[PDB]
Amino acid sequence: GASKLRAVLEKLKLSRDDISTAAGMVKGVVDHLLLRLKCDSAFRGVGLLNTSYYEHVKISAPNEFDVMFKLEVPRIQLEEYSNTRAYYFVKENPLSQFLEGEILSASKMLSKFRKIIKEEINDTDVIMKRPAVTLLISEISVDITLALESKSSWPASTQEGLRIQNWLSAKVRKQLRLKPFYLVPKHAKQEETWRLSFSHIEKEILNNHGKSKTCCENKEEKCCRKDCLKLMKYLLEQLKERFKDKKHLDKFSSYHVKTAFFHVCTQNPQDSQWDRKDLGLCFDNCVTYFLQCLRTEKLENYFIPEFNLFSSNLIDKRSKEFLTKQIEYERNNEFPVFDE
Amino acid sequence: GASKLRAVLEKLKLAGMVVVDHLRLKCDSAFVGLLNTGSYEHVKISAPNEFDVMFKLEVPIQLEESNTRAYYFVKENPFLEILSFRKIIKEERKRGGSPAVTLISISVDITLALESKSSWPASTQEGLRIQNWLSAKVRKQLRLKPFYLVPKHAEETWRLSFSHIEKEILNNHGKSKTCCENKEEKCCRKDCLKLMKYLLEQLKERFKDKKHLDKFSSYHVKTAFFHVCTQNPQDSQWDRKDLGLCFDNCVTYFLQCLRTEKLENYFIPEFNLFSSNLIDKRSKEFLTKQIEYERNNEFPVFD
Ligand SMILES: *C1=[C@](*)(*)[C@](*)(*)=[C@](*)(*)[C@@]2(*)=C1(*)C(*)(*)(=O)O(*)C2(*)(*)C1(*)(*)=C([O])N(C2=NC3=C(Cl)C(Cl)=[C][C]=C3[N]2)N=C1[C]
Ligand SMILES: *O=[C@]1(*)O(*)C(*)(*)(C2(*)=C([C])[N]N(C3=NC4=C(Cl)C(Cl)=[C][C]=C4[N]3)C2=O)C2(*)(*)(*)=[C@](*)(*)[C@](*)(*)=[C]C(*)=C12(*)(*)*
Ligand SMILES: [Zn+2]
Ligand SMILES: [Zn+2]
């Protein structure tokens, strides 16, 4: 049972350690691009969220890197687009070079951003492909996202989200909410909107994830929260590949998995509910919660609970039924897709 | 038999205005603001009308110590020679340099300190041993925070200060992140500290005339308390229902430190706060005998 899941986790771990050289090459290109973006008046304030130089969206693709370059906005003014809760318009300004009226243009900023990188990479066989920019290094992928940074308090749409109060405590929720939030240019299908991003909060939670501060720092306190998440992400990625030729799994992403996972951490706040010896049942409970979300068509954003990731306006019912059928098959046959 | 200690805590439970706002100092050059951003501190639990405020100044340094481990020389900036204000505030104190300009008909002891965002000095490498208590990740995080330099005589020196870390630990003090946020998880760590501070303050007043207790401070009490928290890392060893024994164990640890002449700095372990060089054994023995008398007699000093 769990021995099979553990074998999967061991090969997933080994596959992601052998990236030393690649990681170096990414750091090199990133340092180059940030130094050069800074030569422009608009981008002098660019920088890495944390001096973490990279992340991986797909657990099964260690050669595919993801980085975010952030840019601080001194006094940002947000205005909600069409009642979406997650999509906003952004309103002596080093970005006045891109204001189309009182609105900051996602199209203008990205065009300049893409030009500097294209030019800077024309100076290691690196090619640009049109996540603002995707770079192909040698024949290593690097996705670069541009985000605005705001140190103002979080938008009211997040007021009832991040319900980690019975898990990570009320004190942590307050401290987390004093941190900046980010905006990424993103078409609200309108093209000039920006989407809220709390990716940096999710990272701090996953790496400081127990009620006990010493959770996973000793043998007595080993939990399987991170193992369960990894197994859920790998499940989706493998199914997305088998049917990459079909349209049914195109709208599903690792964001859906993480959101469902955080919701189960809220439901199961005690470390004793995530004991490593119970990897099998904990995983099965995470799969079951995710399936319940697919059948009832409900997956609330962890930070914005009024935004339903699984509504019929985003993903049709047939796609959710197809995914449900595939995961249920895998669950009843001890996940053969893991071995494929 | 802890019902008396609870009565004391209720008494200690039963309109700050800072002037600190003056802004006026910002109208100068060298001056730079409050360390307790948005928060007013009470060095003495028994003195609600005695306030302690700290002003901080950022300094992007070349510290040099002798082997004091705590006293250093601070080697476009808005003095020199090795770096060395009261007159500034004198327009709008013998304890070394801090506090200074104590000031309100209510005292506001103001300390001015330098802020460094450089790594902590090597002398602190083996201190802050909260790893089995608050965890390794909290130790690492806390050590990425700034440290402060307070003017204090060791010629002219500056002394390290970690009072802002002690604050963050005291207000986030359990193994569980939800320690004291629900009925199931109420501990008595803060109450034990308050009772230890009150005991020292009440005895420092009884023997105000004598010189035996002149060198003892709330700092000694807090340092001993933190060591007790390190020795007893689990929330279950601090259960609120056991206030009586937890307090008694804190008093005992402090007494062991006095008898053995050994109280290490929590941040700088090689700095002995209770060495014979700083405090005479007869002062430590005098305090020991007064504390033991108080423990044997249900703390009359609290009455
Ligand atoms: C000034 C104003 C308010 C309280 C105090 C002072 C002061 O200097 O005495 C206390 C005080 C104090 O002595 N300390 C110490 N910090 C410290 C360190 Cl970091 C080392 Cl390594 C050795 C000795 C001490 N004493 N902190 C305060 C608040
Ligand atoms: O805007 C962006 O969306 C996110 C993003 C998350 C979060 N997850 N994905 C994602 N998962 C995934 C899988 Cl499991 C497979 Cl098999 C294939 C492709 C994806 N994508 C996201 O795209 C994101 C991440 C980086 C940059 C921009 C975004
Ligand atoms: Zn854990
Ligand atoms: Zn507590």
Same domain for B114 and B184? no
Residues 6+ apart with CB under 8 A from A219: none
Cβ-contact A175, A205 below 8 angstroms: no
Q: Which domain holds residue B253?
A: 2-14+120-146+162-302
Instruction: Tell me which of B39, B132, B177, B184 to substitute to probe the interface with A (most A C-beta atoms closer than 10 Å).
Output: B177
Given B161, B194, B222, which residue is the final one in a domain? B161
Among residues B289, B271, B287, the alpha carbon closest in space to that of B214 is found at B287
Which of the residues A167, A213, A219 would you substitute to probe the B interface, choosing the one with the greatest number of B C-beta atoms within 10 Å?
A213
Tokens of residue B11, six digits: 């008494």
User: What is residue B176's DSSP assignment?
Assistant: B
CA–CA distance, B48 with A6 (Å, rounded to integer): 58
Which two three-digit tokens encode residue A303? Answer: 């930070």
Interchain proximity A172–B176, CB inside 8 Å = no
Task: Kindly provide the b/e burial profile for residues A254-283, where b requires at least 16 CB atoms within 10 angstroms of the residue's own CB.
Answer: bebbbbbbbbbbbebbebebbebebbeebb
The CATH number of residue A95's host domain is 3.30.460.90
Alpha helices, DSSP H only, in chain A?
A: 2-17, 20-37, 106-121, 170-176, 199-207, 225-242, 254-267, 279-295, 317-332
Candidate from A255, A337, A340 with most ligand 2 atoms within 8 A of CB, to mutate: A255
Instruction: Assess whether A140 and A242 both reside in one domain.
Output: no
Residue with tokens 């039924």: A321
- Tell me: is residue B50 an annotated ligand-binding position: yes
Residue A172 · residue A164 · CB < 8 Å? yes
Residue in the block written with tokens 């941190």:
A179
Q: From the CB of A58, is ligand 2 less than 6 Å away?
A: yes
Closest alpha carbon to B41 in B118, B107, B98: B107
Cα distances from A264 to residues A163, A164, A296, in angstroms, run 11, 11, 16
Same domain? A55 vs A190:
yes
Nearest ligand for residue B101 CA = 1
Return the residue whose CA atom lies nearest to atom 22 of ligand 1: B70
Cβ atoms of B140 and B11 closer than 8 Å: no
- Cα A147 off chain centre by: 13
User: Within a 10 A sphere around the Cβ of A233, how many other Cβ atoms?
Assistant: 21
Amino acid making up residue B289: K
A74 plus A163 within the same structural domain: no
Distance in angstroms between the alpha carbons of the first and the last residue of chain A: 17
Angle between helices A2-17 and A279-295 (to 10 degrees): 90
Task: Measure Cα distances from B116 to A87, A315, B121, B140 in Å.
Answer: 40, 52, 11, 17
What does DSSP say about strands A141-150 and A64-72: parallel, antiparallel, or unpaired?
parallel
What is the distance in A from the centroid of ligand 3 to the CA of A54? 23
In the PDB record, what is the listed experimental method? Answer: X-ray
Which one, of A169, A263, A159, A198, lies nearest residue A68 by Cα? A198
CB atoms within 10 A of CB B38: 5
Contacting residues for B164 by C-beta, under 8 A, at least 6 apart: B35, B145, B148
Q: Report the alpha-carbon angle A289-A290-A291, nearest 5.
A: 90
Tokens of B106: 């209510």
Query: Whose structure tokens read 């069409």?
Result: A82
CA of A256 to the centre of ligand 2 (A): 10
Tokens standing for B120? 């902590």
- Domains in chain B: how many in total? 2
- Evaluate: CB of B43 within 6 angstroms of ligand 1: yes
- Domain co-membership, B186 together with B155: no
Cβ distance B175 to A217 less than 8 Å, yes or no, reads no
Contacts of range B40-44, beta carbons closer than 8 Å, 24 or more positions apart:
B40/B16, B43/B109, B43/B218, B44/B197, B44/B201, B44/B218
- The answer to whether residues A131 and A206 belong to one domain is no
- How far is it, in rounded angstroms, from Cα A270 to Cα A210? 8
Q: Is B115 exposed, middle or buried (0-12, 13-18, 19+ CB in 10 A)?
A: middle
What is the stated resolution of the deposited model, in angstroms? 2.3
User: Distance (Å, rounded) from C-alpha A166 to C-alpha A174?
Assistant: 13
Residue B264, annotated as binding a ligand: no
- Cα distances (Å, whole numbers) of residue A136 to A112, A125, B247: 20, 8, 64
Residue A308 β-bridge partners: A300
Contact A213 B137 (CB under 8 A): yes
Pull the structure tokens for residue A315.
């993903």
For residue A213, the distance in angstroms to the closest alpha carbon of chain B comes to 6
Q: Token pair of A329, please?
A: 């098959």
B41 and B136 share one domain? no
Compute the distance between CA of residue A239 and CA of residue A249 in angstroms, rounded to an integer.
8
Q: Does B134 touch chain A (CB under 8 A)?
A: yes
Helix, strand or coil for residue A310? coil
Residue of B nearest to A208 (CA): B137
What are residue B110's phi and psi, to 5 degrees? -105, 125
Distance CA A205, CA A173 (A): 10
How far is Cα of residue B149 from the mean position of the Cα atoms in its chain? Answer: 14
Instruction: Please work out, in degrees rounded to the nearest 5, the angle formed at the alpha carbon of residue B174 by the alpha carbons of B169 and B178.
Output: 115
Residues 6 or more apart in contact with residue B52 via CB below 8 angstroms = B41, B42, B43, B99, B108, B109, B111
| Nearest ligand to residue A239 Cα | 2
Q: Can you tell me the distance from the alpha carbon of A281 to that of A287, in angstroms, rounded to the nearest whole number?
A: 10
Tell me: do B92 and B130 sit in the same domain. no
CATH of the domain at B124: 1.10.1410.40
> Whole-angstrom Cα distance, residue A238 to residue A268?
27
- What radius of gyration, in Å, describes the C-alpha atoms of chain A? 21
CB A274 within 8 Å of CB A227 = no
Are B277 and B139 part of one and the same domain?
yes
Q: Do residues B103 and B230 both lie within one domain?
A: no
Burial class from Cβ neighbours inside 10 Å (0-12, 13-18, 19+) for residue B76 reads: exposed
**Spatial separation of the C-alpha atoms in residues A61 and A115, rounded to whole Å:** 28
For residues B37 and B94, membership in a common domain is answered with yes
d(CA A135, CA A307): 32
Q: Which residues contact A153 (CB under 8 A, 6 or more apart)?
A: A177
Spacing, Cα A96 to ligand 4 middle (Å): 50
**Which of A165, A214, A217 is the best substitution to test chain B (most B C-beta atoms within 10 A)?**
A214
User: Is A56 annotated in some ligand binding site?
Assistant: no
How many Cβ atoms from other residues are within 10 Å of residue A336's Cβ? 11
Say yes or no: CB of residue A66 within 6 Å of ligand 2. yes
Both tokens of B48, joined, read 């609600």
d(CA B299, CA B276): 28
Helix (H, G, I), strand (E, B) or coil at A110: helix
Continuous segment of H or E residues that includes residue A182? strand A181-185
Structure tokens at B190: 């803060």
In terms of Cβ atoms closer than 10 Å to its own Cβ (0-12, 13-18, 19+), residue B15 is exposed
Determine the Cα–Cα distance for residues A91 and A103; give it in Å rounded to an integer. Answer: 5
B178 contacts A169? CB cut-off 8 A: yes
Q: Are residues A217 and A149 both part of a single domain?
A: no
Chain B partners of A166 at a C-beta cutoff of 8 Å?
Answer: 178
A216, A223 Cβ separation under 8 angstroms: yes
What span, in angstroms and rounded, lies between the C-alpha atoms of B169 and B145?
A: 13
Whole-number Cα distances in Å, A253 to A141, A144, A202, A237:
18, 18, 15, 8
Closest CA to B111 of B52, B159, B29: B52
Joined tokens for residue B100: 């200074």
CA distance B188 to chain A (A): 18
Q: Report how far residue A191's alpha carbon sits from residue A195's, in angstroms, rounded to the nearest whole number.
A: 11
Query: Which residue lies with its CA nearest to atom 7 of ligand 1?
Result: B98
Nearest CA in chain A to B172: A171
**Peptide bond preceding B99: is omega within 30 degrees of 0, i.e. cis?**
yes
What's the rounded Cα separation, in Å, for the pair A162 and A174? 10
What Cα–Cα distance (Å) separates residue A205 from each residue in A13, A164, A171, A211, A328? 20, 9, 14, 11, 29
C-alpha to C-alpha distance for B166 and A236, rounded to whole angstroms: 46
DSSP per-residue letters across B203-271: HHHHTSSSSTTTT--HHHHHHHHHHHHHHS-SGGGGBGGGHHHHHHHHHHHHHHHHHTT--B-SS-TT-
Specify the ligand 2 atom closest to the Cα of A60.
Answer: 16
B57 pairs with which residues across the strands? B114
Answer yes or no: do A213 and B178 touch at CB < 8 A.
Answer: no
